[PDB]
Symmetry: C3
Subunit: 563 residues, 3 copies
Amino acid sequence: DGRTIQEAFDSLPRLESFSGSTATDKLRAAITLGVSEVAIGPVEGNGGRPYEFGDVVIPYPLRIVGCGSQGINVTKGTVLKRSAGASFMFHFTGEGQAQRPMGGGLFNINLNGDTATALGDIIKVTQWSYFKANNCAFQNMAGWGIRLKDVMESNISGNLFRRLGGPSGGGILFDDVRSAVTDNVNNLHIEDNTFALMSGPWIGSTANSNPDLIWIVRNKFEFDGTPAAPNTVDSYVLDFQQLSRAFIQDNGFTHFTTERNRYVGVLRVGATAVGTIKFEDNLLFACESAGLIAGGIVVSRGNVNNQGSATTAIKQFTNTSSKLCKLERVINVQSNGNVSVGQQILPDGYINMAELPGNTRLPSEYDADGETTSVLRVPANTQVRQWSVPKMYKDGLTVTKVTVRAKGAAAGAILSLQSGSTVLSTKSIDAGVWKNYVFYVKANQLQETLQLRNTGTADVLADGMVFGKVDYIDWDFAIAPGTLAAGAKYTTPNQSYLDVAGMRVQAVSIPMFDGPTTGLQVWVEATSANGSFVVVMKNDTGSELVTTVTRCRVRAFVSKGHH
Amino acid sequence: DGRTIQEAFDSLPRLESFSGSTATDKLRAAITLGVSEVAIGPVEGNGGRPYEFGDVVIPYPLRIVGCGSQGINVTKGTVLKRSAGASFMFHFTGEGQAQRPMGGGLFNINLNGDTATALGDIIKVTQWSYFKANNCAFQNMAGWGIRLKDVMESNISGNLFRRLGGPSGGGILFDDVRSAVTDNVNNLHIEDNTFALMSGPWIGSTANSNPDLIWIVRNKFEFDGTPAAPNTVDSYVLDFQQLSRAFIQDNGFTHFTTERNRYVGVLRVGATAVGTIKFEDNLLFACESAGLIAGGIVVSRGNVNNQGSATTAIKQFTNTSSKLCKLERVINVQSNGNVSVGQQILPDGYINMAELPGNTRLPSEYDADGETTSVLRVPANTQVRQWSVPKMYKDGLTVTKVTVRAKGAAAGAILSLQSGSTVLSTKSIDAGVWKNYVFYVKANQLQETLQLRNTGTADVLADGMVFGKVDYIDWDFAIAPGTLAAGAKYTTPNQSYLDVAGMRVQAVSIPMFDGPTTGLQVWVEATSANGSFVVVMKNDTGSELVTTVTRCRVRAFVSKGHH
Amino acid sequence: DGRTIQEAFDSLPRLESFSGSTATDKLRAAITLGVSEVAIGPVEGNGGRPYEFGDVVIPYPLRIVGCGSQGINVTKGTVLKRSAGASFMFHFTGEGQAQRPMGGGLFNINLNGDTATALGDIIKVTQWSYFKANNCAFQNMAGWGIRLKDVMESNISGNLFRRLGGPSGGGILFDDVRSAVTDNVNNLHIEDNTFALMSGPWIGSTANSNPDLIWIVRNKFEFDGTPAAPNTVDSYVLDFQQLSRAFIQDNGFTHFTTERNRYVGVLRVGATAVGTIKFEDNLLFACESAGLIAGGIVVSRGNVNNQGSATTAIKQFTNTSSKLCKLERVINVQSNGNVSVGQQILPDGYINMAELPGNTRLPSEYDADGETTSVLRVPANTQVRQWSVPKMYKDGLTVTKVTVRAKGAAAGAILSLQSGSTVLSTKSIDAGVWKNYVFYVKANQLQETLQLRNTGTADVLADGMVFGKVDYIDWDFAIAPGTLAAGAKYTTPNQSYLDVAGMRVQAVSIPMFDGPTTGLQVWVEATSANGSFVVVMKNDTGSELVTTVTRCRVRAFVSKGHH
C-alpha cells in the first residue's frame, strides 16, 4: 500500500477488467457493485476484436466510458458488437425502480450489431432521464439503433447512425408512452449527428408516442446507399406519427428519392400529431419531396432544395392536416442556380382563414382548389373567424372591404360580416364552387372587431380572405325615369354620402345603369358639400322617350374629411 | 519504480485522495501544488455520502473532473454538497492575479447546496474567461446556482438547474460589472440545459451588469413546482435588467403563470437595456405572458404558445421601450389546435416610424392607441424620419402618397413632407387625438429621398405611416360661376395636368362641389391631350340661377405616359 | 501482478511517457503500436514548459487526449508548441491508407506555434472523416491554425483561435479538393468557438475547395487587435471563394473595419460559389461592411449591426452574383438606439425577377439602378420568367396587371406577356434606360400561368415586377366626330365590356381625349346592363364646330358580376 499516502490496488479506474468471467457476464459485477463509471478500453485489449455484449440490463445511471470516436471503422478505439442472437446490447431501464434512473450513457463508443441483418434493437432506453450518448456510433443491423420509451431530459449528439433499420427498424425510435400519455419522449436533443445509408424511419415515432420539445437540428441526413435490408414500404427520413413541440432546423438532407430505397419524402407527420413542428431553414440536395403532413400545427419556412442531379424539382408538402399549417414553399433551385420553383405567389393581402383567431374549433380539410389546399369547414350558425380592426383604420374616415373565398358544401350557406352582433351585410354562398364574396364596411360602421359567420343552414368551406382599406365604394340604387316627353328630364332620388360610404364622398364615376340609356343626356348634381348627389337624365332625342332602366350605379370615391 | 520504463507512484491521475486532512482542507493542497486537473470519484469512495466542499477558492484555471452526470439523483456518480454554513462551494476568481484565469470548470458533477434553503451562492465565478460547466447539476438551495461577475468567453451547457433561488437567489446570475462597464458577462453560451422547479430569475442580470453576446438557446424551462423558497415578488423566468446582443431562441417554456409561483411573464427586459435581443422561435406551453419589455432593441418573432390547460391565451409583451422594438405576436393556439390569438393584423403597408432611419435620436414612448403601442416623440423643428424612394417609382410617372398617423402633444405641431429641404406639403396636427395625415407627392416632385419633419412649435407623436404608389390624386380648385341667366354657362379656369398630378392625367371623376349644384348641367372639356381640363356648368333651369358653389373637386386618375 | 485479479504494469492509461527517446520521437512509438488514445498530461510534467511536437504524422484515428482547456494562457493544463522550424505540429492524413481514417482529434489542448511569425500550418487534416477538435486552442503563428483537405463529417467546436494568420495564413482553411470535386470539406460544424486578434481569413476556402453543408454558428468573432503579422491585402473575416450549403448564423462579429487590420468586410463569397449560403441573425458591433458577394445563392436576413463607436453605418453587401440573392438589409442602429439604416423600402408588391421560376438559365448581373442592383439578362426569343396565377384571381371576374421594370441592352427588345403560347400584349423596350412596362390581363384572359418573354431581337435586362389584381382598367379607342353643325352631336362606336375589361364594367371615368374638346358637351350612354357604353359629343357652341380629337379614353372600373 503506502502508495506515498494511500493503498495500492487502486481500482478507481474501474475498467471492464475488474468483474468476472466474460464480457457480458462481467455484466452485473460491474452493475451489482453499483460502480458509477466503467472504462471500456480499445480494440487492442481484446485482440483486434470488439468486446461483445448482449442483453445487458442497466438499472442505474451508469456511465460506460470509452476511448473510441464517432465513425464507421472498427480497427481503432472502443468497439462493441451485439452477441449472436441477442435482442439488444444494453437496456438502460428504470422499470420497477423506486427512484427513476437519471444520468449515464455511452461516451466514445463504436456500437455495432452482430450482423447487418439482425432485427431487434441495439440500445433500448426505457423509463429514464438525462441519458447522454455522445461521440458514438450506431450501426450494422436491420432493427432500431436507439429505441426510446419514457425517456426525458436526454441528449443524443455528435454520433454516427449507419447501416440501420429496414422493414421493422430505423435509427432513433420514439416508442409508445409507457403508461400515462405523459410517460413520453420529451426534451431530447438530436444534434451534430450524421445519418447514413439506413432503412425504415431515420428518426420516427409511433401512433401513441406523444413526443414533446424535440430538437433535431444541425444534423446531416444522406441516402448514401441501400443497406443489407431495403425498405419494403414507401418511407420517410423523419416519420413522426405523433409529435408536439419540435424544432427540425438547419439540417442537411441529400439524395432522398423513391428510386433510392423508396424515400418518397423527407418528413411525414401523422394525423394525430399536435404541437408546433418547426421545419425551418433546412438545406436539401436532390430530394424528391418535402413529404406529407397529415396532422398537427406545422410551420415550414426557409427551406431550399438544390435539385442537383435529381430529375425533378422537389415536390412541396402534401398537407391534409386538420390544423393550421403555414407551409412556405421549399424553393427549388437547379444545379445551375436557376429557380424553377419560387415562393408561392399569393393573392395580394391573402390570409388563410385558419391563420385568423376565432371562438370555435373548426377543423381544416383538403380542397385541391383552395389557395393553400387547406380550408375551414364552418357549420350553420357558427362563427368563421373574428379579427381586430387596425387602429389606423378606426378614424371614422376609412372604408374597408372584406373579400372571402368560399364554397358552400350544399345549398343554403350564408356568410354574414358583422361588427359584434350587428350584421353589416350578407352573401348567399353558391354550392359546389369557389367564389369571391365581397363585403364593404362603411366608414361609420367600423369598430373594434369584425367577424364572419355562417348564418345559413349548410356548411361553408372558407379558404382565405383579403381585408383592408379601400379608396372607393360601389353603390347601386333604384331609379324610375319612366317615359319622358321631348326635352323633359328626370332627377333620381338623393344619394346621401351617409348611405353611400358612411362618410364624405370625394367624387363619383360616370353613372351606369341596368340597361341602355340611349338618348338620355346624363349629368350629376351635388346636393351637398359632403358628396351627396342626384343624377339627372334628360331626354335629348326631340320626341317621347320610353326609358327602360330601373337601377343606376356609380363607383364613389372616398378620401378623408372636408379639408 | 522501473514500471517497465518509468517509476511507480504515478500520481498523474491526481484524484482528491492525494492532498491532506479533509475534503476542503485538501483545498489548496490541490490548489497550492497548482495541479491542472483533479479527479473527483463517485459517491462510493465517500461511503454513499457526497464529498462536501465549502469556501474553496480557485485562482487558476483548474479542471475539477468528475464521473457523474446532469441529473437530480445523488446515489450514483460524483456528488458535491455545500458545507453547513458556507456562502459558496467554489469561487473561481482571478481577483488580484497578474494574468487573468482562463479555462477550467466543472465536468460531470452533481452539485448540491447543503440544505434546500441556504441563501448564498453555489458556484461564484469572478474575473475569469473560458470557464466551462458541462454535464453538471446545480440544485438544492435558495440562493444563486451560478453567480457570474466579469466572466467572458464562457460556456454553461448540458446542465440541470433545479430547486434553486427564491427571494434573493435564482439560477445563473449576471452580476454587476467588476470595475469598468467592459468588465461584464460577455460571449457566454447557455445551451442544452434543463431548468426546473426554481425561484427568483432562472437567468437574470443586475441593473449594472452590461451583458453582451449571450446565447440562451435550445434549453428547456419548466415550472415543475414551487421549491422550498417561493417567490416573494412578481417574477420572470428570464429577468435581464441589462442586456445587449442576445439570442434567446429555440427554447421550450412550459407552465409559467402567476398562480404557479408568481411567474407573471417569461422574459423581462430592463429600461436601461441596449443591444439587440432576439427572442425568436421559442415553443411555449400554457404560459401566461411573454413578459414586459421596458427597454432595449428587442426583436421577437416565430414564438408560438400552445395554451394547453391554461385558462387564458398567452398575453403579448407589454412594451414601453424607448427604442425600436419589432414584437411579432406570440401566436396562441388552444390545445385543440384552434388559433385564438393570430398574427397582428396591421394596416396595409404600415411601418412603425421607429423602423425608419432618421438623423435625430427620438425616444419611443407608450401610447395605448398606437398601432404597436410604441410611438415617436418628435419636438419642434426636428426631422421625424427620412427614407429612400424606391427606384421603380422614380420614373417621373408615379404619384405617391404618404399617410402618417400622428397626435399633437399640444396645439401647434405641424408635419411637413419634404424632398430634402424642399417643402412638398404641410398638415397642421390636431392636439390630443390620433388622426391620419395624407400627403401626396406629384410625379414631378419625387426624387431620391423623402422626409417628414415637425415644422411646428409643439411636439408631435408619430405612430407609423403608409407610403406607396397611388393611381390617382384628389384635386380641389376655386370656381366662381356666379349668377347665370337662362341658358348661360360658366367655364372654370383650366386645370393643368402639371398642377393636378405633375404628369399626364388619364381621366377624372365626375366633378363634385362645396355645395349643391341644383339646375347646373355639368360636363368636362379636355383642354389638352395630357388630361388638362375645364369644367363647364350650364344653367339648365330656364330662368336666372344664383349658384352658391365656390370650389370644385375631382379625383384625377393617372397611368403612365401618352402611349 | 496479481493486482487483486490482473497483472500490474497496467499501461492502459497510455500517457506519452510510454514510448521512446523524446516528445516527437515518441512519435510513432505511440503511432506504430497503433494505440487508440494517448494522454498528454499538464505543463507540470515537462517542468513548466509545453511539450514540443513537430511534423508528427497520424495515419489512423488517434485520440490525443489532454487535461487543458480552451484559453490563451499557457501556465495551466496541457500545452503544445510547434518545434523550431517545423511546417506543422500534427498531420492527420489518410493519404495512401487502404481504409480512410475515421475518428480521432484533439481534446483539451492548448496548441501554439513555436513563434508568433512562423508561416506554415499548426494542424493539417487531409483525407479524413469524423475529426473532432474540442475544448482546444489554436494560436501564435502567422500561418493557418487548422488546414483541411478532403475532410468530412467533422467537428471543430468550443475552441479558441487567436494570433493566427497573416499574408499567407488564417484560422480554419478549407483547402483545394484532394482529387475529385467530391473530395472536399463537407458536413463540418464550427460552433461555440472564439476567434480573436487574427490575420488573413478567419475561416476561408480556396478557388477549388467546393465545400458543402458547413455550419458556422454561435461563434464569436472580434478584431481584438493586430497580430505579429498584419494583413497585406484588403481582407474579410469569412472569405469563401467557394461555398455550397452553409449556415452562417447567430454569430457575433465585433469591430471589423478597414482601419483595424484591413477587414474591409465580414463575409466575402467568390464568383464560382454555388449552394445556398444562409447569412442570418448575426449580431454585429461597429462593423464596417457586410461584405462582397460575387457569386452563389446567398440569403441574408435578420442581421443587425449596432454601430457603436464606428464612424459610419455598416455598409450593405455589394452583390454581383450571377445567381438569385435575397439580401435583406443589415439594420444599422446607432449606439443610442436610433435606426440610421432600416429595412429596404421596396415598391409595393415588388418581386425581383430572379426570385421567380423560369425554364431558362438567365445569369443575373449588376446594374446600379436596379431595385436590388441585381437584374436578369434575357436574350431574344427567350422566356423571362413564368409564374402561377393565384387561385383567388381565377374566378373569371378579376382584372390583373403586370408592371415590369426593364431596360433594353440595345434597340429592338420586346416584352410579351403571355398565357402559355397566347400573346396577351406587347411593349417595345427602350434601349439604355429603366422604364416601367404595364400589361393588363383582361378578366377573360387569365388562366393557370403567366409568362413574360423577350420576343424582340436584342437583350432585355429585367429588374423586377409587380403583379396583382386591379379594380380598374384604362381603355382608349378611336373616334371621328368630324365637323358638327350647330346643335349636332356625334356618338362614338360602342365600347363593349368584353373589349374593355373582359368582364362586366361597373362604371367609367369622365372621358378624356387626345386633344381639346372645347365646345363639346360630353356624356356617356350605357348600351347594356354590363357596362358597355358610347360617348356622346354634342356641339354646344351655336355654330359649326370643327373638332380635332381622334381618340377618347376612360378609366373603366370593375367590380364583380351583375349582383
